Write a protein that binds this ligand. Structure first.
Ligand code: OGA
Ligand code: MG
Ligand code: NI
Ligand code: ZN
Length: 331
């Protein structure tokens, strides 16, 4: 078995290997990358996402989200308070302000220490989940707006044509902005490109151990767990690496820098934080190997998770027994 310790793997494809996206994902899996739940892909030196980032300041963040924490430093939830619209240029200036800027630090490890010590005492503002793309239309390789769609994959594997669409999302971050512990909708893959700015630190639990994280989460968030049998789908719970280690949960960590891709694999729980002002693009995708994960994915039906239009068909076709309850949660 390749990668039996489930380490995060880093890949350096050549420009020739960067042509065929599906082929390369399958290659990474042949080497055991998916066992980690997360892999890093460093693009060939010849590649670029676009020519410059000099002209992005007029993008609008219609609903910036202030991430307010509750709990203790290593075990907390966050809720998202909606703020007034602002442009990317305004948000960048806010991120760089004395109130929100990255503190002085020695290295990524020092900064990580500071994050987990102090995160709860601040409320950073995240420009998350903005439909759009920063890839140039002429970028032919690993362009996240030109990937094969999940609806086409389901049709190719299973024969059923379905409605829905699959487009990327932009994320503008600042110091301490946080992504809570989650797997993707329908336990899909994700791919994330860090276009510019400061790094993003990731934590990940191997897919084969995801239920160990779920069991800890039910212990640590006992009210939430009574409310919903899949409350991690709400994407609000944080657990620090120290707490995970104290509880014997297998996990790994890595820091993504500008110019790098990360892929999350089906049922790979992940969480993390941004180091300072940055912009990422991410989208979900599927492969043939995903279908069995999609059929077994948990679902939130309590009403909290509320998701895209396109998840309807995935539940309807892959999980017809669950469909009626899940759709009630959507309504
Ligand atoms: O970058 C973020 O805030 C969160 N991203 C993801 O969870 C992802 O790409 O799957
Ligand atoms: Mg602009
Ligand atoms: Ni994700
Ligand atoms: Zn729920």
């Amino acid at each position: 078995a390749q990668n039996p310790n489930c380490n995060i793997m880093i890949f350096h494809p050549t420009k020739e290997e960067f042509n065929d996206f599906d082929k390369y994902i399958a290659y990474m899996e042949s080497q055991g990358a998916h066992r980690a739940g997360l892999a890093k892909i460093i693009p060939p030196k010849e590649w670029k996402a676009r020519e410059t980032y000099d002209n992005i300041s007029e993008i609008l963040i219609a609903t910036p989200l202030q991430q307010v924490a509750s709990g203790r430093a290593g075990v907390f939830t966050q809720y998202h308070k909606k703020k007034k619209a602002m442009t990317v240029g305004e948000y960048r200036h806010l991120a760089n302000s004395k109130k929100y800027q990255t503190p002085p630090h020695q290295n990524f490890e020092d900064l990580e220490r500071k994050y987990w010590k102090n995160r709860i005492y601040n409320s950073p503002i995240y420009g998350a989940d903005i439909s759009g793309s920063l890839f140039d239309e002429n970028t032919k390789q690993w362009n996240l707006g030109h990937l094969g769609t999940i609806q086409d994959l389901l049709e190719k594997e299973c024969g059923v044509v379905i409605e829905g669409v699959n487009t990327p999302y932009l994320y503008f971050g600042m110091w301490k902005t946080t992504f809570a512990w989650h797997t993707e909708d329908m336990d899909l893959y994700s791919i994330n490109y860090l276009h510019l700015g400061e790094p993003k630190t990731w934590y990940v639990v191997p897919p084969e151990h995801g239920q160990r994280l779920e069991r800890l989460a039910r212990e640590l968030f006992p009210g939430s767990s009574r409310g919903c049998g899949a409350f991690l789908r709400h994407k609000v719970a944080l657990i620090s690496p120290t707490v995970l280690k104290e509880n014997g949960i297998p996990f790994n960590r890595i820091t993504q820098e500008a110019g790098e891709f990360m892929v999350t694999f089906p049922y790979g729980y992940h969480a993390g934080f941004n180091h300072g002002f940055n912009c990422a693009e991410a989208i979900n995708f599927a492969t043939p190997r995903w279908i069995d994960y999609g059929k077994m994915a948990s679902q939130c039906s309590c009403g909290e998770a509320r998701v895209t239009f396109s998840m309807d068909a995935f539940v309807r076709i892959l999980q017809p027994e669950r469909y009626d309850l899940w759709k009630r949660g959507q309504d």
